[PDB]
Amino acid sequence: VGIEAAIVLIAFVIVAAALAFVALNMGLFTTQKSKEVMQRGLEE
Amino acid sequence: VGIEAAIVLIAFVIVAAALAFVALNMGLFTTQKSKEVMQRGLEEATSALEVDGSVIANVTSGSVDAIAIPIKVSPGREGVDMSVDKTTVRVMLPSKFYENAYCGVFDGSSLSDSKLSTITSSIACTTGWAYLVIFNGDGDNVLELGEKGLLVLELPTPLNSYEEFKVEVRPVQGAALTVERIVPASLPTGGAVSLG
Amino acid sequence: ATSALEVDGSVIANVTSGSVDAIAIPIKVSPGREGVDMSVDKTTVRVMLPSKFYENAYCGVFDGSSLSDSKLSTITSSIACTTGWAYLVIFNGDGDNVLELGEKGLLVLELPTPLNSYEEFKVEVRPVQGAALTVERIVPASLPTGGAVSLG
């Protein structure tokens, strides 16, 4: 009974880790691009 | 009549004991592995790594030669391993694409001083160009909180004016860092130029 | 349960004569170590094209000895496969045909005259153990006359 619950837990944790990786990567990229675009606006 | 019943009982009890032994052994192992995997997931959640400041480039003879990208670790400590065999740096150029230009991490002993020319000149890599320089570190190849890292590219005759470049870092654990900048129109004949 | 395999980074494509020729898909192993076998006889790669469908285009895994350098052109040119196109290139590996943690893999497609502008493609990897990886990207409008172009 416990073993399958542990397997499901492992799967759900692994899914969450991938979501976190994607979220941080894209958030950092979009923050950098926002910095660049507002810098360009100030230049303009 | 009783004796054979006792023998069957003994056999069935012995079978149950073996099943119990197997069940407890494998249950303990799988619980330990679940603990380890969720711990690793929590580790992967943190250790983001991010750009701290402005990218600064070296220009010689009217063209951009070297690029310095300042990075730091995100809140949450849990440092990122910057070893040669565990980290890969991707450089995407207008006419070139490089999958792995990482050569390693050399300690920032402050050299003679913190000049960009001194850093780009004293440090050399046997193969590849991109290396990372740690400041205020303890001498390890892991970037931790309290340590400032400056990642340097040595580019032989790329990067004229106005074209874009893309630099990506791929740690073994944590999110890949994406950096994209455009070279400004105004470039001095020498010295560092800020890329914003 | 473990050994998921996942995309690490951005898919990068090679464009020649105004059309996309080769596709590089960076992948890594998920947390939990427990590497994925990348042998020829155990892994199948599916490519779904707008006018074509291929069930198995995998030709094998060749070690990333860094060649002369890490150019996309050098990788696509030096490596050749007897049958099929898609191969995987391991970096920082120990020379085995298994992708483990600490090893970086770049899966490359050699596509003869598919992939104009704006049409979608689908790439799927089917390991013997672990979840199949699904990759779908769209070619951007702006393609240079040469060199690599990022697909995001």
Q: Please state the φ and ψ torsions of residue C138, each to the nearest 5 degrees.
A: -120, 135
Can you read off the two tokens belonging to residue B26?
A: 């494998």
Q: For residue C73, how many other CB atoms are within 10 A of its CB?
A: 16
Task: Provide the 3-class DSSP secondary structure of residue C3.
Answer: coil
- Please say whether the beta carbons of B46 and A27 come within 8 A: no
Closest CA to C121 of C75, C53, C59: C53
Longest Cα–Cα distance of chain A, Å, equals 65
- Please say whether the beta carbons of B82 and B106 come within 8 A: no
Mutual orientation of helices B2-45 and A2-43 as an angle, nearest 10°?
Answer: 10
Q: Quick one: three-class SS letters along chain B?
A: CHHHHHHHHHHHHHHHHHHHHHHHHHHHHHHHHHHHHHHHHHHHHCCCCEECCCCEEEEECCEEEEEEEEEECCCCCCCEECCCCCCEEEEECCCCEECCCEEEEEECCCCCCCCHHHHHHHCCCCCCCEEEEEECCCCCCEECCCCEEEEEEECCCCCCCCCEEEEEEECCCCCCEEEEEECCCCCCCCCEEECC
Here the contacts of A38-41 (C-beta below 8 Å, separation 24 or greater) are A39/B196
Closest CA to B93 of A36, C149, C143, C137: C149
- Please say whether the beta carbons of B34 and A10 come within 8 A: yes
Can you read off the two tokens belonging to residue C120?
A: 């979608």
Separation of alpha carbons C12 and C34, rounded Å: 27
| CA-atom Rg of chain A in angstroms | 19
Here the contacts of A19-28 (C-beta below 8 Å, separation 24 or greater) are A20/B44, A20/B45, A21/B44, A21/B174, A21/B175, A21/C6, A24/B48, A24/B74, A24/B174, A24/B175, A25/B175, A25/B176, A25/B177, A25/B178, A28/B48, A28/B50, A28/B51, A28/B175, A28/B177, A28/B178
Can you read off the two tokens belonging to residue B24?
A: 């407890």
Residue B77 CB partners (closer than 8 Å, separation 6+): B46, B144, B145
- In this structure, what DSSP letter does residue C34 have? -
- Please say whether the beta carbons of B57 and B183 come within 8 A: yes
**Amino acid present at B46:** T
Separation of alpha carbons C70 and C91, rounded Å: 10
Q: How many CA atoms lie within 13 A of C67 on its CB side?
A: 19
Q: How many CA atoms lie within 13 A of B151 on its CB side?
A: 29
Closest CA to C27 of C3, C49, C48: C3
**How far from the centroid of its chain's Cα atoms is residue A26's Cα?**
6
Q: Dihedral through CA C109, CA C112, CA C118, CA C121, nearest 10?
A: -40
Type and span of the H or E element at C45: strand C44-48
**Amino acid present at C138:** I
Closest CA to C16 of B95, B48, B27: B95
Q: For residue B78, how many other CB atoms are within 10 A of its CB?
A: 18
Separation of alpha carbons A39 and B196, rounded Å: 8
Q: For residue C149, how many other CB atoms are within 10 A of its CB?
A: 17
Interface contact flag, B96 C28, Cβ < 8 Å? no
Q: Which residues pair with B107 in a beta bridge?
A: B134
Separation of alpha carbons C13 and C137, rounded Å: 11
**Amino acid present at C125:** V
Chain B residues in contact with C108 (beta carbon < 8 A)? none
Interface contact flag, A18 C32, Cβ < 8 Å? no
> What distance in Å separates residue C92's CA from the closest CA in chain B?
5
Q: Read out DSSP for C62-121?
A: EE----SS-BHHHHHHH---SS-SEEEEEES--S-SEE-TT-EEEEEEE-SS---SS-EE
Q: What letters, b where the CB count within 10 A reaches 16 and e where it falls short, cover A8-41?
A: eebeebbeebbebbeebbeebbeebeeeeeeeee
- Determine whether B43 is exposed, middle or buried from the number of CB atoms within 10 Å of its CB (0-12, 13-18, 19+): middle
What's the first-to-final CA gap in chain A, in angstroms? 65
Chain A residues in contact with C2 (beta carbon < 8 A)? 10, 14
Technique behind the model? cryo-EM
Interface contact flag, B37 C2, Cβ < 8 Å? yes
> What distance in Å separates residue C31's CA from the closest CA in chain A?
7
- Please say whether the beta carbons of B130 and B119 come within 8 A: no
Type and span of the H or E element at A31: helix A2-43
Chain B residues in contact with C31 (beta carbon < 8 A)? 37, 40-41, 43-44, 173
Closest CA to A36 of C14, C148, B54, C52: B54
> What distance in Å separates residue A1's CA from the closest CA in chain B?
10
Interface contact flag, C147 B97, Cβ < 8 Å? yes
Q: Which residues pair with C58 in a beta bridge?
A: C86
What is the chain C residue with the closest CA to A6?
A: C1
Q: How many CA atoms lie within 13 A of C147 on its CB side?
A: 13
Type and span of the H or E element at A20: helix A2-43
